[PDB]
Amino acid sequence: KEMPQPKTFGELKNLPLLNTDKPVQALMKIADELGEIFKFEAPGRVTRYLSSQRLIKEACDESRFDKNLSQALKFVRDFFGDGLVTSWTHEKNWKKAHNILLPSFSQQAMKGYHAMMVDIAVQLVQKWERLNADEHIEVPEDMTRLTLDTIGLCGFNYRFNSFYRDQPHPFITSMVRALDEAMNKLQDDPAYDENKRQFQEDIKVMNDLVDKIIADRKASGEQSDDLLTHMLNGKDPETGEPLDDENIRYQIITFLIAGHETTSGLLSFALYFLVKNPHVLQKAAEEAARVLVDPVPSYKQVKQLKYVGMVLNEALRLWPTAPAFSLYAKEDTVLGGEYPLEKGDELMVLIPQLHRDKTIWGDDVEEFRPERFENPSAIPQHAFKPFGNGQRACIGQQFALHEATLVLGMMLKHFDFEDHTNYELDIKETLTLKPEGFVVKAKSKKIPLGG
Ligand code: HEM
Ligand SMILES: Clc1ccc([C@H](Cn2ccnc2)OCc2ccsc2Cl)c(Cl)c1
Numbered sequence: 001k002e003m004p005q006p007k008t009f010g011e012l013k014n015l016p017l018l019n020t021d022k023p024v025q026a027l028m029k030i031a032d033e034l035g036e037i038f039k040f041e042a043p044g045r046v047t048r049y050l051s052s053q054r055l056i057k058e059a060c061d062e063s064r065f066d067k068n069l070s071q072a073l074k075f076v077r078d079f080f081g082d083g084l085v086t087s088w089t090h091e092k093n094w095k096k097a098h099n100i101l102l103p104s105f106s107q108q109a110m111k112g113y114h115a116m117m118v119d120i121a122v123q124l125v126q127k128w129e130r131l132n133a134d135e136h137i138e139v140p141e142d143m144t145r146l147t148l149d150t151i152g153l154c155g156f157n158y159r160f161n162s163f164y165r166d167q168p169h170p171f172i173t174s175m176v177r178a179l180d181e182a183m184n185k186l187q188d189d190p191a192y193d194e195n196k197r198q199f200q201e202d203i204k205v206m207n208d209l210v211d212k213i214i215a216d217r218k219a220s221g222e223q224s225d226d227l228l229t230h231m232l233n234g235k236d237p238e239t240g241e242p243l244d245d246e247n248i249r250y251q252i253i254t255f256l257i258a259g260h261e262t263t264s265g266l267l268s269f270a271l272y273f274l275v276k277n278p279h280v281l282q283k284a285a286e287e288a289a290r291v292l293v294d295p296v297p298s299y300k301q302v303k304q305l306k307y308v309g310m311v312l313n314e315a316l317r318l319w320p321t322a323p324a325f326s327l328y329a330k331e332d333t334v335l336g337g338e339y340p341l342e343k344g345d346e347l348m349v350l351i352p353q354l355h356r357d358k359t360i361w362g363d364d365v366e367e368f369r370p371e372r373f374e375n376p377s378a379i380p381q382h383a384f385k386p387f388g389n390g391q392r393a394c395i396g397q398q399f400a401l402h403e404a405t406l407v408l409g410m411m412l413k414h415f416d417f418e419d420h421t422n423y424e425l426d427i428k429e430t431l432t433l434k435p436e437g438f439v440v441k442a443k444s445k446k447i448p449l450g451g
Contacts, residue, residue: 013041051353070326081250151259265321288412295450310370415442
């Protein structure tokens with residue numbers, strides 16, 4: 001009945017516990033100590049972190065709890081506006097944008113996206129084919145090159161050309177530097193006149209890209225029917241109106257970021273686990289060689305990479321790259337027959353801890369075993385939630401998994417991988433998670449590509 005709560009620092013409640021670069025991992029340690037639920041207090045705010053499937057399945061009941069804009073989400077709303085990720089479920093532009101953009105992520109749009117995904121995937125493979133002996137691969141860096149280019153090309157017919165650059169595309173660098181400048185600005189001096197600029201030019205770099213993506217499309221003798229097409233011309237089935245110009249800008253920035261960061265972390269973590277578990281890599285590589293018999297993979301061939309998809313879900317089990325989502329109680333209710341909640345109370349689903357629930361997965365929760373996912377009907381409801389919940393679940397789930405399956409399959413078909421530094425897992429936390437510094441050597445199997 002009584003709610004566990006970690007340690008207090010007087011007025012600053014529990015916050016100094018998150019005075020760290022890895023707050024999610026710190027919150028996971030707190031969950032290990034206190035268990036399935038614990039209150040976390042901050043000046044003027046209370047959050048309850050859930051970690052067990054028993055409680056989280058109640059939280060995922062949309063008749064009792066709806067998606068909450070956490071403080072983090074309310075903060076980044078300055079950048080993402082009332083786009084799909086940062087709007088309330090009862091905000092009119094959420095339902096309207098959901099209705100308009102849902103057809104862009106169907107298992108029919110994916111068929112039309114496939115060739116452009118292959119385009120960027122081939123560029124990745126060719127980069128690694130062209131490395132000299134004893135040169136190595138910066139894995140999350142190259143996965144980000146891939147996922148950024150893929151969402152840019154598939155969604156907006158815009159080429160970031162990340163494999164033509166030595167460092168991240170200026171749009172990425174400007175946003176990363178703009179987000180932290182907004183973080184530090186919360187804490188009017190002469191020496192900040194340089195900061196308020198790096199800011200202004202960063203805002204301009206991103207407004208210029210959004211302007212160009214829209215202008216390129218309007219000037220195009222267009223054979224285009226992609227995500228941007230529906231943003232600009234899709235009519236709402238309810239109201240019959242398209243999205244307004246301001247919301248469209250927010251959706252473009254929303255999908256550019258959401259469309260690549262979490263998928264890059266997934267591919268990075270999957271390759272990390274494969275090189276740390278050579279028996280699983282050998283098994284996945286055998287499926288890639290068996291299934292991908294053509295110079296470029298086809299849509300149907302990717303859908304037959306069954307074990308690769310299991311490798312991906314097991315990487316999402318251990319390190320779901322969007323590791324938490326927030327809910328609020330629609331009315332007074334009792335959670336799990338033990339914990340009374342008031343209307344408006346916030347719940348935070350700690351996905352990595354949920355995915356380590358021994359009562360669901362057994363004692364070996366830390367082992368990388370993709371065979372856990374051989375029979376999806378053996379996985380209880382709400383035990384596996386890497387893509388959120390309900391009507392506010394990830395609209396891009398199928399996009400991410402198709403891209404990641406295609407790419408990982410092509411990686412396994414064309415290269416043997418060596419953990420040449422004996423890499424020690426270091427998880428950097430930004431908007432997503434990724435294994436920082438993860439490097440490998442890839443020896444080419446010398447299998448031709450197509451074109
Ligand atoms: C492995 C990769 C990904 C993971 C783990 C992931 C995870 C999630 C999660 C947990 C949520 C719910 C957030 C919340 O409740 O506050 C969400 C929502 C969302 N995601 Fe993803 N995502 C991934 C890839 C993508 C991709 C590729 C796209 C776009 C192409 C995308 C776009 C979105 C959008 C627009 C929403 C908001 C949906 C709505 O509320 O209407 N995500 N995602
Ligand atoms: Cl605290 C927090 C941090 C990051 C995210 C999302 C996760 N994610 C990515 C793709 N699907 C879900 O990434 C940041 C982001 C990207 C566009 S808008 C927006 Cl916020 C959320 Cl939801 C909440």
